Design an enzyme around this catalytic site. Structure first.
Site, PDB file in Angstrom:
ATOM      1  N   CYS A  32       0.610  -1.250  -0.022  1.00 51.03           N
ATOM      2  CA  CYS A  32       0.026  -0.057  -0.015  1.00 51.03           C
ATOM      3  C   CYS A  32       0.817   1.205  -0.116  1.00 51.03           C
ATOM      4  CB  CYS A  32      -0.918  -0.116   1.302  1.00 51.03           C
ATOM      5  SG  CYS A  32      -2.520   0.967   0.786  1.00 51.03           S
ATOM      6  N   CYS A  35       0.177   3.941   2.882  1.00 53.24           N
ATOM      7  CA  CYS A  35       0.729   3.374   4.384  1.00 53.24           C
ATOM      8  C   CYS A  35       2.227   3.790   4.370  1.00 53.24           C
ATOM      9  CB  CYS A  35       0.693   1.717   4.259  1.00 53.24           C
ATOM     10  SG  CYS A  35      -1.003   1.160   4.236  1.00 53.24           S
TER      11      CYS A  35
END
Lengths: 105, 105
Positions: A32, A35
């Site tokens: 991600c 993230c």
């Protein structure tokens, strides 16, 4: 500093040992993008607020904790107070992160 | 039937070989509850619409495809037409899935 959670047992223990303190859990995934972008800020936060416990759970590593916490988006921040979830939101929003911490602390 | 994608090369090839057809990609994760709930329906859809290509990408397996497609929630459905993304939404919504297919086919 941020505690790295690598088991369901460890998750429960930390929630228990937090006692009175607010626990902020960051559910992330290495693939991600968002993230990775917000990780440094999340760490900076753990150094700024020492009266708050900061937890990191990689969904790949702890699929069981991920599942049980019903995480579906990345990153997801869940807030706990005395074993009970008191807040939650997803997305790498810095302002909202700190803002929510200041509301629940 | 649903094609299981296990590489970035395979993803590109299938998009290329789809030619004129609409490609619906299901980005899922084994730990995600919603993802498991909607899998049977997603397969049923591939048998109902043979003029549409149905792809399955496990984000754990293809972190590179996951990242490049900027997936952040699970499940995420991305729609492609001639190599170009023409639609996208997340969440295991059955009606909306079929509804979107009928709009882009």
């Amino acid at each position: 500093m941020v505690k790295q959670i690598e088991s369901k047992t460890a998750f429960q223990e930390a929630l228990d040992a937090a006692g009175d303190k607010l626990v902020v859990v960051d559910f992330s995934a290495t693939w991600c993008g968002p993230c990775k972008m917000i990780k440094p800020f999340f760490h900076s936060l753990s150094e700024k607020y020492s009266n708050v416990i900061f937890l990191e759970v990689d969904v790949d590593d702890c699929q069981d904790v991920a599942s049980e916490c019903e995480v579906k988006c990345m990153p997801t921040f869940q807030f706990f107070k005395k074993g009970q979830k008191v807040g939650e939101f997803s997305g790498a929003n810095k302002e909202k992160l700190e803002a929510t911490i200041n509301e629940l602390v």
